[PDB]
Amino acid sequence: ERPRLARFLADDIKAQRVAVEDAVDRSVVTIRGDELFASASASVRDEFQPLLLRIADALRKVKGQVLVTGHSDNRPIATLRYPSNWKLSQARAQEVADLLGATTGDAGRFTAEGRSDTEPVATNASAEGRARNRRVEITVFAE
Template sequence: MPDNNFNYDDEEQEKGAPKWMVTYSDMVTLLLVFFVLLFSISSVDAQKFRSLAESMRGDNIHEGYESIIENQYQPASNPEIAEAADGEEDSEEKNEEEYEESNEDNSEEEPSLDELLKKINKYIEENGLEEVISAARDKRGVLVILQGNILFDTASAEIIDEAFPVLEEVASLLNEVSNPVEVQGHTDDRPINTYRFPSNWELSGARASRIVRELIEESVDSSRLLSVGYGEKEPIASNATKEGRQKNRRVTIVIIDTSAENESEDQ
């Protein structure tokens, strides 16, 4: 009599590999694929690195551009770029030569201070200004002394109209040389005490500064100019007389002799 309790599912389960083996096989296969992928990637990166290194050593990338290393230049393979670079170098050399030549010409054309003094005295003589302007030479350089009465009204630092043509000529002469210029303001010893000028220091300083401003307006380079107020401390005549006080009220323009300064520094 047949056994009615026979289980066909049990018989089917006994055939083939266990189920866990399938999972294990899949895992091993995935691991194998993963390691193969890693190996292939690492091989490609190394090859790319070698290719990049070779291209960097060659002239393919930096043709026609300056090297980051000082004093090293990669020549341009493009003849047009090379031609342009040569043209720029020639142009720069030409500009430098022209600049040096112009400086030499200017230095040759610039008169000496002695020649400038002669020009100033000639201007004074031709215009009959001997009574109000004088020029001399000393160890500091050339001194141009302008009496205060041809420049300013009493107790004022505003230039009078008659002084502008004189200052225009002075500026023109100053522009013939490149020496530094010191503008000195001086007064007599009579005290002053006004709202604008509490003392002769302020008055002399304001007058010197006003002359400097006018010279700048007449195109004298401001970097060459210096203004100083001495008040009544450096008289050139006695303040006991009217004539002496008039001489002391003055503006002195000192064109400084830089060669003399250089010689004293060397000693």
């Protein structure tokens, strides 16, 4: 009934690569951007794809709809491809959704939204706080 993912992500939780909230109606996997993407990029580094693969494996077992929200800090590293923190946050969420959709083969199950710096979980006044704000939150709803 209740979507529960922590049980499938023990190693990543212990290594502090992800955090998982198993809530009443959702499981939310928070992943710092640094665990997936190079600085200022929305491509999941080859070396870190296995982390998303473990999430895909878990999502095969808990067949709820999935929302991916992307978040930035308030200190943009603007580039040609991502001219704002908003665009980077959207692109990061969308890349995660796209990769998970392709691996599960569930078309329409994953959607994405970029939320830029509007939903911090930490201060932006330290480097470590900014690194916590740059993140995706992957929400799986009840099956």
